[PDB]
Amino acid sequence: LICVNENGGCEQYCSDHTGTKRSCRCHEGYSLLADGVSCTPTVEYPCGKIPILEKR
Amino acid sequence: IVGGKVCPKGECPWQVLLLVNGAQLCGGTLINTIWVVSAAHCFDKIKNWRNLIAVLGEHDLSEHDGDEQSRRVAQVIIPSTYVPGTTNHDIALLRLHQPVVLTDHVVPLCLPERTFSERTLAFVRFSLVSGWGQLLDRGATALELMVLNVPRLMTQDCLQQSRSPNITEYMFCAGYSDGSKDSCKGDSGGPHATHYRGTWYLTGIVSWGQGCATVGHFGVYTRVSQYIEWLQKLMRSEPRPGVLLRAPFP
Ligand SMILES: CCOc1ccc([C@@H](Nc2ccc3cnccc3c2)C(=O)O)cc1OC
Ligand SMILES: [Ca+2]
Ligand SMILES: [Cl-]
Ligand SMILES: [Cl-]
Ligand SMILES: [Cl-]
Numbered sequence A: 001l002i003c004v005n006e007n008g009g010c011e012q013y014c015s016d017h018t019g020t021k022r023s024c025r026c027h028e029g030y031s032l033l034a035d036g037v038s039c040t041p042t043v044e045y046p047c048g049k050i051p052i053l054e055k056r
Numbered sequence B: 001i002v003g004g005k006v007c008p009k010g011e012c013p014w015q016v017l018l019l020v021n022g023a024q025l026c027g028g029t030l031i032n033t034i035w036v037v038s039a040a041h042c043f044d045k046i047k048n049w050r051n052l053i054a055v056l057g058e059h060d061l062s063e064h065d066g067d068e069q070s071r072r073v074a075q076v077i078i079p080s081t082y083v084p085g086t087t088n089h090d091i092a093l094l095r096l097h098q099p100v101v102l103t104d105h106v107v108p109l110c111l112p113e114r115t116f117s118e119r120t121l122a123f124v125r126f127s128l129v130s131g132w133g134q135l136l137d138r139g140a141t142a143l144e145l146m147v148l149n150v151p152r153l154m155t156q157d158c159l160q161q162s163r164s165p166n167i168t169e170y171m172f173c174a175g176y177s178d179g180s181k182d183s184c185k186g187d188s189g190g191p192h193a194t195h196y197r198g199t200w201y202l203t204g205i206v207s208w209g210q211g212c213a214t215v216g217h218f219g220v221y222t223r224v225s226q227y228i229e230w231l232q233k234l235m236r237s238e239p240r241p242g243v244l245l246r247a248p249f250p
Helices: A052-056 B113-117 B155-162 B225-234
Strands: A011-016 A020-027 A031-033 A039-041 B015-020 B023-030 B035-038 B052-056 B069-079 B092-096 B126-131 B146-153 B171-174 B190-198 B198-210 B221-222 B242-245
Touching: A011 B113, A011 B155, B015 B035, B023 B052, B023 B190, B023 B198, B035 B198, B035 B225, B069 B225, B092 B225, B113 B198, B126 B198, B146 B155, B155 B171, B171 B198, B198 B225, B221 B225
Parallel strands: B069 B242
Antiparallel strands: A011 A020, A031 A039, B015 B023, B015 B052, B023 B035, B035 B092, B052 B069, B069 B092, B126 B146, B126 B190, B146 B171, B171 B221, B190 B198, B198 B221
């Protein structure tokens, strides 16, 4: 997979590495799940999320 | 903002209001607890640098509801390449004197990596612009925070569809050429925010145009992707005496 196509499948940030290798990353306040692509918040108020809508 | 709607309270939690001697100056975007991104041109006529205030959690300018948080602006950092009275490199990074407290009504917008922003965010068609600027060209400013969804144009298409200063690689156009919907003067420095897979990111800064919602013309926004490494480096730096700092760009 490559980052320039479809964001490399990553939810957030994407790095290309030497080989057919791709690493996804997450912003501060998020951690990467075992799927290697998804980011889940690790803090109460992660950037770019709207609390009143996240609560619903 | 012309042609938008009230941003429901708490739904634009990264929006900053900048004041100078208590008067409305510009907007901005919170990107973490002590840093705000705005437009360089907002500071072209500042006399007392020590009376700049940033307000977070603001919504309705007519009332105080307790969610508002005010901070003094300790530093205004502008790239070396910005020339006052002109349009290019229209960005400022503001350090608050004390962090704001994150709450349901005060949340930073994510500053994206450059690659993610250039390769992915830049192809998201619509994004939100917001502020307490003029509701009409030559009209009164808004008392409640307004927001507008605007589509982004490739620069070749903007130039072809427009009928000014140059649209540089440090800019992009967004909005509508039919005179119905635009950001305006008083929105300057505010966010152009782009959603991607459940999260919002800073992609633009309200910068300039030819009158607000002028038929034949689009809003022009500072292309934040060009400045990610510049901003990141500055956020790791120690504060310096004196409010204004000109910092080399690149
Ligand atoms: C080459 C003309 O230069 C300028 C003209 C007007 C402005 C005003 N700002 C905006 C901001 C957003 C806008 C969006 N749509 C339409 C018009 C908009 C105007 C302002 O702050 O006075 C800034 C400028 O250069 C930094
Ligand atoms: Ca208020
Ligand atoms: Cl949590
Ligand atoms: Cl959406
Ligand atoms: Cl000073």
